[PDB]
Design a protein around this ligand. Structure first.
Ligand SMILES: [Mn+2]
Ligand SMILES: [Mn+2]
Ligand SMILES: [Mn+2]
Ligand SMILES: [Mn+2]
Ligand SMILES: [Mn+2]
Ligand SMILES: [Mn+2]
Ligand SMILES: [Mn+2]
Length: 1156
C-alpha cells in the first residue's frame, strides 16, 4: 500500500509517505482543541527539527556504567538459570557466594583453586584442552568470565583469515581515509604494512617506519595519528582538526568510546568510519599476534609465565649486584620501581623509565632490556594494547569448553545453543536463606493468616499475639496448644503447624537475649548472620565474616555461633516480602500472600509486572559510534516511524528508504595540491579554487588534457556518465569532443597524449586511478561500477537499518524463519543528488525547512523505484540475508543493463561521450516480474507537483531542559507566564498549589521550550523563554522562484523581473508575520541601491535575505554593503491571548488550546 522515506540529520528528520505511483497521500486528522476547528487536511510529508541540548532524552542516550552493569548481570542471570539445578546438587550456595572474596564454601577448595588457577585464563585453557571431566563450578566460572566480557561485535561473520590480515585492513584504512580527502589521497602502492606493523619493535618505531614508506606525511599528521592509534599509542587529534581543546585517544582506555563520541561531536560524524577502520586495524594486529585450542588464554598464560621468569631473574640479579636498591625496587609502592608498578600507581612508561638506567648499569642481562625496548618486559594481566577483543574468540573457547564437557554433563549438551546465544544475543535479586528469620516469619504468618475458628478469620492483634505467645515460646505449635491458648472449633490447620520459627529458637539458645531478636533495627544484622551461616560450611570463613559483629556479642557467644550452619535456600527474595511497599506484604500478612500479589487495587502486582521488564532502545543507540546529535536524530526517526505506522492504521509499510549524510578547508587542500604540483615542475588566490573549471585549469597547468595545446584562462568525464556517475575531479577533465572520440574511455589515438598525463601523475596533479582510467572498459569494471553506486559504506546507517528492521520484523514462521514484512532500503545520497540535478528538481537550503521533507520524498521515490527495477540487487542495499547474485550475468553484451549507470532508466534518452543518443522507452518496467517501475510522462509530473505544494508539516520539537528553566507554566489572580527551574521543579511536582501560593488552579498548562502559538493573519510564534519569542512561520515559495534562484546564484536573463517579484513576496511575508519594518525598509532600500549589480550576485544576496524570514531565532545577516541586525521579540504578552498549538511529532495530530 505504501512506503516511508526519511532524511536523517543531526538537527532534523525529514519524512514522507508514498504510494505505488509515488503520490503523497492527503489525510484528514482530528483537532482536539477547544477551538471550533474539528478536522484538518494534511499531506503525509514533513520534517522534524530538533535542538541538541540537555534533556532527559539526551542523558538517556549517553553510556553509563550502571546500564552496562545491569546488562552483564542479566546475561549472567540467564547463565545461572541454566546451571541452577545441577549446581544445587553440587553446591547449593555457590551462586550466592559470588560478588578478596571466597568463591568456595570452604578453605580447602578455595586455596586449591587459586593455587591451580592463578588467572582465569589458566582455567579457560585447561577447560578447553583437557579431556577429563571437570567440576561444574569451574566450567561455570570460565563460561561466566567469557559471557561477562564478551567483547565487541564489529565483525559480523564467523571469523575468517581476512579478518587477521594486517595488509588488507591497512588498505581499508587508507581507502576510507582517501574517501574523506579526495584532494590529497594517500598512496598505499606496494607498502609492506604487515611486516612493519607486526614487527617486534617499539610502537613508536613501527610508526616512524610505516610513515617512512609514505612520502609527504609527517608523524603528527592525521593518518599518522590514526596509525599511532592502531599501534597502541595515544595520539592527540586537536592539532589535526584545529580543536580548541585536547583530544587524546587510546583504544585500550575504558573511556575511548565516549571520548571518540566527543571528538565526533566536534569534527562531525563523517570521520567515525575512519576511526572504526583504525580500530579494525588494531584488531588485525592483535589477532595476527595471538594466532601466531584457546590461543587467547594461551597467550595470556604466556604473558604470565614470561612475566614471572623475568621477575625471578630480575630479582636474582638485583640481589647479586645492587642489594641497596632491592627493597626500593620490589617493596616500595611509593617509588616507580616494580612495587609501584604492580601495586602502586605507576604507568608502564614511568616504570620502564625507572628501571632503564638500572638494567643498563646492571650488565647482568641485556635480554630484559630487549624486552623492555619492545615493551614486553613485565606486562600485566589487566591490559590489551589498544583494543577490545572480538567476541568470536570467546565464542570459540565457549564452544570448546562446552563440546569438551557435554558428555559428562548432559544439560550442557542440551542447552549448548542457548549458552552460546546468551553470549551472542543483544525479580532482580536472589532468594533468602530458607532458615532466615524473615523467611520463617513470612511462612508462619502466611500460614497463620488463613485460620477459621468460628464460634457461636484471625485478627492482626490476634496474629501478633499468637506468634509472640506460641511461635516464639514453643519451637513448634501443635493445634491442641492453639485451642488451649484460645481458652486462656478451629479450621485451616492440621494436627500441628508445619511452619516454625526454628532459627528464632536456635539463635535464642545461643545469643541468650530475647530483646535483641525482638528489636527490628537489628534485623539486617541477623539476616547477614544467617546468610553467612548458609553461605559457608567452613568455620574459619564464618568466623572471618562474623568478626564485623564481634563487639555486639560475647566471645563465647561467637564461638557458639560458629558451630551453627544452615543448608537450605528459600523461594522468595527479601524485598518481595519487606522491600516493596503500598505497606509491605509482610505488613499485610500481619488476605493471602498470593491473593495479595493478585489484587489490582494493591500496588505489588504493578510493581512486579514492571519489575520483570524493568531504556533498551536508548541504550542500544547509546553504544553506537556517533555524536549525541546524530543519535538523538536516530531516536526521532524511530519515533516518527512509529507514528507514521499509527497514522496508516497499523499496516506496515512495504518499504523504508533511509539516507544519512552530512548536509573553505577543501580550498586549502586544493591549494596544497596546486602548490606542490606546480613546485614539482597568472597567480590567483584560493577562494575561487572552488570553481571547477579554474581548479581543473590549475591542476592541468594551463593546458588541455586531450590536445596538447595550452588554454587561456578566460569539461568531460573520463569514464562516461552512461557507465557511471562520477562528478568527482578524479573522473573530470578540462578540455576544448576533441580527445573523447567514442563511448570508450579517451581514444587510443589520444592515448599518445599519455606522457603529459604521466608528468601530471608524478606531480600529484592527477591520481593514479585517473591515470589508469585515461589510459584505458572491461565488463568487470562495469560490475565494480554497479556495486559502487548502490552500497552504502557508512556504518551508522547500517545500524539504523538494523534497528528499523528489528522494530519492523518480529513475527516468526513455523520453521522459525523470520517473516520479513518490511524492507529497509539505504540509499546513497549521490543518487538523489544527481536525480535532483538531471531532472531540474533544485534545492535551496535557505528558503525554508521544506528541503528535508522533499529529500525524504525523493529518497522514497528513488529507493522504491530502484528495488522495483532491480530486485536481484536486493542484497546490496536492503537489510537482511539475501542471495548475492552473480553480477556478471546481469551485465550484458551490447544487445539488466549494458550501460552500468543504475539511474539511467529514469532518463528518456541518454547522451553518450561521443554525443550519440540512446533513446529509452517512455515507461520503464521489470522484465522478470512484469511490474511497472517508472512512467516518464506522469511520474515526473507527480514529483514536480509534490515538491510544489505549499503545505508541509514542519515541527520544531518542544523540549524540557534537565539559573536554567525546564519549562514555563501558564499561571492563573491574572494571566501570566512563570519559569520553573530544575531545582524548583521537584517541590513543584509534589505540592504545586502551595508553591504557586508561595509565589503569590483548575488549569495546569506546562509550556515546553519552542511551544507553538498562533495569532492573527496566519502568524506563529514559539516560546523560547518566558522572556522571549521566536518566529514560527515557514515562508513557502513557488517552485519557479526557487529554481530561478538556484539557476541565478549558480550562474535565462529574460526572467530578470522575478527578482522584483521575489523581493515583493519576501516583503509581503515580512509584513504579514515577521513584523520588523524598520529592517525591511533598509532591505528594500539596499535592493534599490544595487540593481546595477549582475543578476548572480543579486540572487545570492536575495538568498541571504531569507534569514530574516527563517523560522526560529532571529539572526543578523548581510545584504550587499548593508548589514541587518536581528530583531528579538522580547515581549511574550501577545502569546497569552494567542491560540496554543500542541503538535504531534509528525505534526499531523494537533490540539489547539485557545484562551483569551
Ligand atoms: Mn540528507
Ligand atoms: Mn528453620
Ligand atoms: Mn600564460
Ligand atoms: Mn536533511
Ligand atoms: Mn551549489
Ligand atoms: Mn552568501
Ligand atoms: Mn555596494
Amino acid at each position: 500500500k505504501y512506503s516511508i522515506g526519511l532524511d536523517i540529520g543531526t538537527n532534523s528528520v525529514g519524512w514522507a509517505v508514498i504510494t505505488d505511483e509515488y503520490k503523497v497521500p492527503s489525510k484528514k486528522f482530528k483537532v482536539l482543541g477547544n477551538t471550533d476547528r474539528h478536522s484538518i487536511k494534511k499531506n503525509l510529508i514533513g520534517a522534524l527539527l530538533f535542538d541538541s541540548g540537555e534533556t532527559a532524552e539526551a542523558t538517556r542516550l549517553k553510556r553509563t556504567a550502571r546500564r552496562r552493569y545491569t546488562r552483564r548481570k542479566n546475561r549472567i542471570c540467564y547463565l545461572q538459570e541454566i546451571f541452577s539445578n545441577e549446581m544445587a546438587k553440587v553446591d547449593d550456595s555457590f551462586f550466592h557466594r559470588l560478588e578478596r572474596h571466597p568463591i568456595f564454601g570452604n578453605i580447602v577448595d578455595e586455596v586449591a583453586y587459586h593455587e591451580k588457577y592463578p588467572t582465569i585464563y589458566h582455567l579457560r585453557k585447561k577447560l578447553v584442552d583437557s579431556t577429563d571431566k571437570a567440576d561444574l563450578r569451574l566450567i561455570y566460572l570460565a563460561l561466566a568470565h567469557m559471557i561477562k566480557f564478551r567483547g565487541h561485535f564489529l565483525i559480523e561473520g564467523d571469523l575468517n583469515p581476512d579478518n587477521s590480515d594486517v595488509d588488507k585492513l591497512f588498505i581499508q584504512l587508507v581507502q576510507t581515509y582517501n574517501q574523506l580527502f579526495e584532494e590529497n589521497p594517500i598512496n598505499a602502492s606496494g607498502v609492506d604494512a604487515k611486516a612493519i606493523l607486526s614487527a617486534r619493535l617499539s610502537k613508536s618505531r613501527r610508526l616512524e617506519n610505516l610513515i617512512a614508506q609514505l612520502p609527504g606525511e609527517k608523524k603528527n599528521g592525521l593518518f599518522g595519528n590514526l596509525i599511532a592509534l592502531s599501534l597502541g599509542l595515544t595520539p592527540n587529534f586537536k592539532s589535526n582538526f584545529d580543536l580548541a581543546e585536547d583530544a587524546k585517544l587510546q583504544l585500550s582506555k575504558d573511556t575511548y568510546d565516549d571520548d571518540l563520541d566527543n571528538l565526533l561531536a566536534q569534527i562531525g560524524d563523517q570521520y567515525a568510519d575512519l576511526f572504526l577502520a583504525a580500530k579494525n586495524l588494531s584488531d588485525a594486529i592483535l589477532l595476527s599476534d595471538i594466532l601466531r585450542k584457546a590461543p587467547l588464554s594461551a597467550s595470556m598464560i604466556k604473558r604470565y609465565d614470561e612475566h614471572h621468569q623475568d621477575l625471578t631473574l630480575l630479582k636474582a640479579l638485583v640481589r647479586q649486584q645492587l642489594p641497596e636498591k632491592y627493597k626500593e625496587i620490589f617493596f616500595d609502592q611509593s617509588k616507580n620501581g616494580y612495587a609501584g608498578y604492580i601495586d602502586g600507581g605507576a604507568s608502564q612508561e614511568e616504570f620502564y623509565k625507572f628501571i632503564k638506567p638500572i638494567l643498563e648499569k646492571m650488565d647482568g642481562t641485556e635480554e630484559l632490556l630487549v624486552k623492555l625496548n619492545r615493551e614486553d618486559l613485565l606486562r600485566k594481566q589487566r591490559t590489551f594494547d589498544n583494543g577490545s577483543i572480538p567476541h568470536q574468540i570467546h565464542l570459540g573457547e565457549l564452544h570448546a569448553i562446552l563440546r569438551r564437557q557435554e558428555d559428562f554433563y548432559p544439560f550442557l549438551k542440551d542447552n549448548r545453543e542457548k549458552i552460546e546465544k546468551i553470549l551472542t544475543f543483544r525479580p532482580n535479586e536472589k532468594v533468602l536463606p530458607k532458615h532466615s528469620l524473615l523467611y520463617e516469619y513470612f511462612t508462619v504468618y502466611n500460614e497463620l493468616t488463613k485460620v477459621k475458628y468460628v464460634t457461636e478469620f484471625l485478627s492482626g492483634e490476634q496474629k501478633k499475639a499468637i506468634v509472640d505467645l506460641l511461635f516464639k515460646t514453643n519451637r513448634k505449635v501443635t493445634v491442641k496448644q492453639l485451642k488451649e491458648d484460645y481458652f486462656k472449633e478451629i479450621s485451616g490447620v492440621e494436627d500441628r503447624f508445619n511452619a516454625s520459627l526454628g532459627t528464632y529458637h536456635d539463635l535464642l539458645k545461643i545469643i541468650k537475649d530475647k530483646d535483641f531478636l525482638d528489636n527490628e533495627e537489628n534485623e539486617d544484622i541477623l539476616e547477614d548472620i544467617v546468610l553467612t551461616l548458609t553461605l559457608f560450611e567452613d568455620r574459619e570463613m564464618i568466623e572471618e565474616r562474623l568478626k564485623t559483629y564481634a563487639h555486639l556479642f560475647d566471645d563465647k557467644v561467637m564461638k557458639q555461633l560458629k558451630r551453627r550452619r544452615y543448608t537450605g535456600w528459600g523461594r522468595l527474595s527479601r524485598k518481595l516480602i519487606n522491600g516493596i511497599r503500598d505497606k509491605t506484604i509482610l505488613d499485610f500478612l500481619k488476605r493471602n500472600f498470593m491473593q495479595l500479589i493478585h489484587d489490582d487495587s494493591l500496588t505489588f502486582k504493578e510493581d512486579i509486572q514492571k519489575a520483570q521488564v524493568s531504556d533498551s532502545l536508548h541504550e542500544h543507540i547509546a553504544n553506537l559510534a556517533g555524536s549525541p546529535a546524530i543519535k538523538k536524530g536516530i531516536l526521532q526517526t524511530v519515533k516518527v516511524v512509529d507514528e507514521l505506522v499509527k497514522v496508516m492504521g497499523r499496516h506496515k509499510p512495504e518499504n523504508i528508504v533511509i539516507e544519512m549524510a552530512r548536509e573553505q578547508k577543501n580550498s586549502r587542500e586544493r591549494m596544497k595540491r596546486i602548490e606542490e604540483g606546480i613546485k614539482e615542475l597568472h597567480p590567483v588566490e584560493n577562494t575561487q579554487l572552488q570553481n571547477e573549471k579554474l581548479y581543473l585549469y590549475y591542476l592541468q597547468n594551463g593546458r588541455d588534457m586531450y590536445v596538447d595545446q595550452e588554454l587561456d584562462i578566460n569539461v568531460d568525464h573520463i569514464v562516461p556518465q552512461s557507465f557511471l556517475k562520477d562528478d568527482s575531479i578524479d573522473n573530470k577533465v578540462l578540455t576544448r569532443n576533441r580527445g573523447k572520440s567514442d563511448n570508450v574511455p579517451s581514444e587510443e589515438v589520444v592515448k599518445k597524449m599519455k606522457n603529459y598525463w604521466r608528468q601530471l601523475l608524478n606531480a600529484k596533479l592527477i591520481t593514479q586511478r585517473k591515470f589508469d582510467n585515461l589510459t584505458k572498459l572491461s565488463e568487470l569494471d562495469k560490475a565494480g561500477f554497479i556495486k559502487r553506486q548502490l552500497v552504502e559504506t557508512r556504518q551508522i546507517t547500517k545500524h539504523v537499518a538494523q534497528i528499523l528492521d528489528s522494530r519492523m520484523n518480529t513475527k516468526y514462521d513455523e520453521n522459525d524463519k523470520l517473516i520479513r514484512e518490511v524492507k529497509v532500503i539505504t540509499l546513497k545520497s549521490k543518487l538523489v543528488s544527481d536525480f535532483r540535478k538531471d531532472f531540474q528538481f533544485y534545492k535551496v537550503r535557505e528558503i525554508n525547512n521544506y528541503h528535508h521533507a522533499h529529500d525524504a520524498y525523493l529518497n522514497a521515490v528513488v529507493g522504491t523505484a530502484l528495488i522495483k527495477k532491480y530486485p536481484k540487487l536486493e542484497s546490496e542495499f536492503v537489510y537482511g540475508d539475501y542471495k548475492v547474485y552473480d553480477v556478471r550475468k546481469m551485465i550484458a553484451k551490447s544487445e539488466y543493463f549494458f550501460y552500468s549507470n543504475i539511474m539511467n532508466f529514469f532518463k528518456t534518452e541518454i547522451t553518450l561521450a561521443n554525443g550519440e543518443i540512446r533513446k529509452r522507452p517512455l515507461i520503464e518496467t521489470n522484465g522478470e516480474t512484469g511490474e511497472i517501475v517508472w512512467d516518464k510522462g506522469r511520474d515526473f509530473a507527480t514529483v514536480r507537483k509534490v515538491l510544489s505544494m505549499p503545505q508541509v508539516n514542519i515541527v520544531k520539537k518542544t523540549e524540557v531542559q534537565t539559573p536554567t528553566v525546564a519549562y514555563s507554566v501558564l499561571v492563573v489572580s491574572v494571566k501570566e507566564l512563570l519559569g520553573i527551574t530544575i531545582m524548583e521543579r521537584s517541590s513543584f511536582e509534589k505540592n504545586p498549589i502551595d508553591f504557586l501560593e508561595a509565589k503569590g488552579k483548575d488549569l495546569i498548562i506546562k509550556l515546553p521550550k519552542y511551544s507553538l502559538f498562533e495569532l492573527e493573519n496566519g502568524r506563529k510564534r514559539m516560546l523560547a523563554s518566558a522572556g522571549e519569542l521566536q518566529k514560527g512561520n515557514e515562508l513557502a515559495l513557488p517552485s519557479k522562484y526557487v529554481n530561478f534562484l538556484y539557476l541565478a546564484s549558480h550562474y535565462v536573463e529574460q526572467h530578470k523581473h522575478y527578482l522584483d517579484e521575489i523581493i515583493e513576496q519576501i516583503s509581503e511575508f515580512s509584513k504579514r508575520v515577521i513584523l520588523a519594518d524598520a529592517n525591511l525598509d533598509k532591505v528594500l532600500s539596499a535592493y534599490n541601491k544595487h540593481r546595477d549589480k549582475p543578476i548572480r550576485e543579486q540572487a545570492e544576496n536575495i538568498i541571504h535575505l531569507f534569514t530574516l524570514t527563517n523560522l526560529g531565532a532571529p539572526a543578523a545577516f548581510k545584504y550587499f554593503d548593508t548589514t541587518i541586525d536581528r530583531k528579538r521579540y522580547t515581549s511574550t504578552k501577545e502569546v497569552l491571548d494567542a491560540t496554543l498549538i500542541h503538535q504531534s511529532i509528525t505534526g499531523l495530530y494537533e490540539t489547539r488550546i485557545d484562551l483569551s
